[PDB]
Design a binder for this molecule. Structure first.
Ligand SMILES: [Mg+2]
Ligand SMILES: [Mg+2]
Ligand SMILES: [Mg+2]
Lengths: 64, 95, 243, 197, 95, 87, 132
RNA sequence: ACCUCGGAGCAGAACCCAACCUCCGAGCAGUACAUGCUAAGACUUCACCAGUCAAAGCGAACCUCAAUUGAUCCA
RNA sequence: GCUAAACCUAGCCCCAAACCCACUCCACCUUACUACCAGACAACCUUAGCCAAACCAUUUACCCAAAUAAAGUAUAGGCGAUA
């Protein structure tokens, strides 16, 4: 009788409870939702990661 | 108190959330310095009669320079405010 | 891993848990008010909604304050609602040119002023805007009492406010010896700004000296176990004599 | 498509047809977020048309108007703003909020002549001129004008909503509740004055 | 060009093609011929109108524009009295 | 094995602790209580009168609407004026 | 707080506004084919090796399909039973139109036919006069 | 020394063809002021950009030369 | 046949939940881990730049307070990249 959805049943992190995405999107979602609670060094590594991934996906590769 | 405004337009934000900033927004321009603006003589009521200004119970507009210099520190005049102008006008009526 | 709470909540959680937890509620409310200051360095939009000249369509607008710099001497001496503006600008008001690191600092003035309640003549570095707004307020003490704290932004002014409210709440003859008439006249003129004595004491203080005063209040030598046991034993012996 | 829906029997022509019933029959999906102010009638399907319905619309072509009036139906336009159209096309999500029925507003600076013309069958236009326009359309497209005053359901055909009213039954300021089904009015002088203004 | 955004992780359009071109839902693109407002006095009138008139685009640059633009600009729109409804859709085509 | 009990929505409203920081502010907001009322009926215990706008809210609303959204009289007046100018 | 008053009598309009969740059985029109060229299925159904069911909206499960921009076909979706008889029947039916026998593709798993070229209206009329 | 455009040969006969290969030139001028609007169909300087020809119709009377030149944004 | 080879544990990474630490025997700011004397010594300042734009000079996302959506829309922009 459609009281719940199968996405809210899974047990896992908070930045992904019924969601999929590449590593860039995952990291930016993680900082959007959890970056305030995150440790300093881990947040710095995450920022560096999103920066490298921006550079890679948008500047580097074939098909342009 | 110089007045400035931002060269770039800030991205609009919610009423509960404060905006994102950037040096693109740190950049400024000057619009007005409000010191070159022409002065405005302030109104004051003088108690003791003085030369060319007025007499007891009289109100008059005068220069900020002179007023802040010699009237107020000496205690001669006071601000043209409703706490006292009614007293001045009623004593004038008595006179 | 992660924290239970964010970082920007840590300071307020500390405010709630610790020595400061014993502080009254009004002081905490005052320090956590976070009320917007009066804009001095920009023209605020008269309306929240505005129509741009490009297209005939509505466009919501929200003013954005300027990150003013308040040096220590500004807090030592009442400047007003202004401070150093640190920023940068384009040369020859041309976007398509060189950017330059700019600093504006207002024109200060060392002037004398007197107050009837403190009965003392103070020397302070003030500004034309300060003079104009106190003239609008029809006296210094009026502005010092009616100042929204974020607009005054001067611990000197806040200390003046503290002392003045304390004196108004106490109604002390300390101020006017041999002039009860003048005393009562001034207190009646400034009657409406009055607030309780404890409020006047707590107001105008940062959390550091707040917790310091709280410690000075709470601190006291511990009553001896010997004394409290003598009391309990006298109670017990009274109960036994009763029974 | 209208004939298709009515002869499939999803929308009841006996009941006054309107945008809510259309969206419930899925005759047209609406995307107010994509700034679609409503639905328009078109010339296509004039033939094989026996609706007789009292359709409510925003836009209307003269061919559709003439066909519906020939078959005896009723056509009249009704401007809805984006938010009003949202509440109309999805009422239940709005009623899950609990805030009262909003008030419609007049058209913008441009469409007032459109919705006030009588040839247009604008809800703001005069009724006295609607017979005239019906007569010109009949005289144009060569079909007698059937007087719908005789049929038993002329009342149904002339059922209409005044501006600043979303639904035929409800009005602004009203609050609806479905869990423990109830309806609520303020009965405060200022509030009702506003919701009537 | 910006295959993934920094804030949302989505493609992002260049407003250049939006200002220069138009898309028809069939998948076609039109454009105003270049040099249509420059140096009209020396150009012969036939050239002047060849420049004034709209034209279409090659499939290559058509799909290039499609690649840089997003689906919002490729959707079906129902405007009022917009002259391009005659041409959004295609008729009597094979192969 | 008996299967775990079926997961189900929490019955009744969800009234969080306002003196609890990690709880967002949009729950403490009034619209939250309005949603709970409209969903779970009057069983929520929420006062119905609170959802309507205060007289101050109504005042600001009528002010802004009078300022921005004109009336039909002024509308047709401006139309006539501009049409006469064009003529 | 502001006052209010309750009512329940005006709930019929809300009941009207409540949307539906199942397709309604269409009404019994006194004469067919009703406008828009709709025609309900004959009863009793025809005794044949196969049978074609209608859709949720009580339409025929013929559709069209385009691929590569040029491959231009029509499909029958939900044939139940011996789909080979049906594909042979449509081949014999369409052979005079083209002068050649199609090379249609049958997926008896899903019960689908796939035929080059658009013949939607013709096949619809055919299935109607057959009474599916 | 040159960097763009046109004509001739190499490239003899549909098209195209390079070299710091050989020659001549251009970066205008002159006459009208329908040197107006629209429009089928075609050529195309090896892509695109650009650049060309033009039937018919409305409206009217009774362009030469070979290149003779410069996109977008912006003002 | 030597040199060698093989092992499976120590423990570790990501999440979730929950907020967290302080010999109180002596010693530790002078030259730290050093039992004992006259000083007036105190913090509050825009991040920049690489890189990208196939050079580079304006410009180039880097969070700060509900997940999705509106929306990569309105807008900004050597109206370019891009935001
Ligand atoms: Mg397909
Ligand atoms: Mg070519
Ligand atoms: Mg001719």
């Amino acid at each position: 009788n459609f009281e719940k959805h199968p996405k809210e049943l899974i047990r896992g992190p908070i930045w992904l409870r019924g969601w999929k995405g590449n590593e860039l999107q995952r990291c930016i979602r993680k900082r959007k939702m959890v970056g305030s609670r995150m440790f300093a060094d881990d947040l710095h590594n995450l920022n560096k990661r999103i920066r490298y991934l921006y550079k890679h996906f948008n500047r580097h590769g074939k098909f342009r | 108190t110089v007045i400035v405004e931002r060269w770039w337009k800030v991205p609009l934000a919610g009423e509960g959330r404060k905006p994102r900033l950037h040096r693109r927004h740190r950049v400024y321009k000057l619009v007005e310095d409000t010191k070159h603006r022409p002065k405005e003589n302030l109104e004051l009521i003088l108690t003791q009669s003085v030369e060319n200004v007025g007499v007891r119970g009289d109100l008059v507009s005068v220069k900020k320079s002179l007023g802040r210099n010699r009237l107020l520190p000496q205690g001669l005049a006071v601000y043209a405010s409703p706490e006292n102008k009614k007293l001045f006008e009623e004593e004038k009526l008595l006179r | 891993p992660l924290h239970k709470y964010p970082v920007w909540l840590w300071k307020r959680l500390q405010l709630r848990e610790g020595i400061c937890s014993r502080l009254p509620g009004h002081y905490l409310r005052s320090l956590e008010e976070e009320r917007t200051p009066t804009p001095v360095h920009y023209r605020p939009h008269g309306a929240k909604f505005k129509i741009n000249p490009k297209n005939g369509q509505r466009e919501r607008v929200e003013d954005v304050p300027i990150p003013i710099y308040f040096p220590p001497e500004s807090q030592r001496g009442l400047w007003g609602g202004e401070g150093w503006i640190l920023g940068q600008i384009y040369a020859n008001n041309d976007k398509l040119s060189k950017r330059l690191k700019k600093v504006w600092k207002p024109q200060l003035f060392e002037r004398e002023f007197y107050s009837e309640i403190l009965d003392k003549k103070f020397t302070v570095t003030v500004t034309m805007r300060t003079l104009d707004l106190i003239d609008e307020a029809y006296g210094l003490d009026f502005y010092i009492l009616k100042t929204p704290k974020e607009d005054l932004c001067s611990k000197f002014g806040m200390d003046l406010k503290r002392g003045m409210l304390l004196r108004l709440a106490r109604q002390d003859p300390q101020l006017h010896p041999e002039d009860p008439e003048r005393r009562a006249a001034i207190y009646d003129k400034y009657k409406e700004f009055a607030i309780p004595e404890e409020e006047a004491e707590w107001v105008g203080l940062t959390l550091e000296e707040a917790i310091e005063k709280q410690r000075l209040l709470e601190e006291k030598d511990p009553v001896p176990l010997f004394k409290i046991y003598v009391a309990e034993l006298i109670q017990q012996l009274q109960q036994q004599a009763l029974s | 498509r209208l004939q298709y829906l009515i002869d499939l029997g999803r929308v009841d022509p006996s009941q006054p047809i309107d945008l809510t019933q259309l969206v419930n029959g899925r005759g047209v999906t609406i995307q107010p977020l994509k700034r679609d102010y409503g639905v328009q009638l078109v010339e296509e399907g004039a033939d094989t048309f026996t609706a007789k319905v009292n359709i409510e619309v925003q836009l209307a072509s003269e061919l559709a108007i003439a066909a519906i009036e020939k078959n005896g139906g009723v056509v009249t336009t009704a401007f809805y703003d984006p938010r009003s159209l949202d509440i109309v096309c999805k009422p239940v999500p709005f009623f899950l909020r609990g805030q009262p029925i909003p008030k419609r507003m007049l058209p913008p600076e441009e469409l007032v002549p459109y919705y006030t013309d009588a040839k247009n069958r604008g809800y703001l236009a005069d009724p006295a001129k609607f017979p005239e326009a019906r007569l010109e359309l009949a005289r144009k497209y060569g079909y007698i004008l059937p007087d719908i005053t005789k049929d038993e359901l002329f009342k149904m055909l002339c059922t209409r909503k005044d501006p600043r009213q979303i639904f035929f039954g409800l009005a602004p300021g009203w609050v609806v509740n479905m869990a423990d089904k109830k309806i609520l009015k303020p009965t405060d002088e200022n509030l009702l004055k506003y919701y009537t203004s | 060009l910006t295959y993934f955004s920094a804030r949302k992780g989505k493609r992002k359009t260049v407003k250049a093609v939006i200002d220069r071109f138009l898309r028809l839902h069939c998948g076609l693109w039109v454009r105003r011929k270049a040099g249509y407002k420059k140096k009209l006095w020396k150009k012969t009138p036939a050239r002047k109108k060849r420049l004034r008139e709209f034209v279409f685009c090659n499939k290559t640059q058509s799909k290039l524009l499609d690649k840089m633009t997003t689906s919002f600009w490729k959707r079906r729109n129902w405007y009022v009295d917009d002259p391009y409804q005659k041409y959004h859709d295609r008729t009597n085509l094979k192969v | 094995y008996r299967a775990r009990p079926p997961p189900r929505r929490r019955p009744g409203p969800r009234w969080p602790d306002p003196e609890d920081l990690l709880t967002p502010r949009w729950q403490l907001g009034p619209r939250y209580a309005a949603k709970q009322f409209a969903r779970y009926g009057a069983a929520s215990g929420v006062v119905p009168g609170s959802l309507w706008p205060s007289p101050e809210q109504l005042r600001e609303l009528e002010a802004e609407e009078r300022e921005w959204y004109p009336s039909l009289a002024t509308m047709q007046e401006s139309l006539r004026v501009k049409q006469l100018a064009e003529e | 707080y502001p006052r209010f008053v309750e009512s329940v009598d005006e709930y019929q309009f809300v009941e009207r506004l409540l949307p539906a969740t199942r397709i309604p059985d269409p009404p019994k029109h006194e004469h067919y084919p009703t406008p828009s060229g709709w025609q309900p299925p004959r009863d009793p159904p025809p005794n044949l090796p196969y049978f074609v069911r209608r859709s949720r909206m009580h339409n025929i499960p013929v559709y069209k399909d385009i691929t590569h921009g040029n491959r231009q076909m029509t499909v029958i979706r939900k044939v139940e039973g011996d789909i080979w008889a049906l594909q042979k029947d449509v081949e014999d039916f369409l052979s005079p139109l083209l002068g050649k026998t199609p090379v249609t593709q049958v997926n008896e798993v899903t019960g689908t036919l796939r035929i080059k070229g658009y013949f939607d209206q013709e096949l619809k009329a055919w299935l109607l006069e057959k009474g599916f």
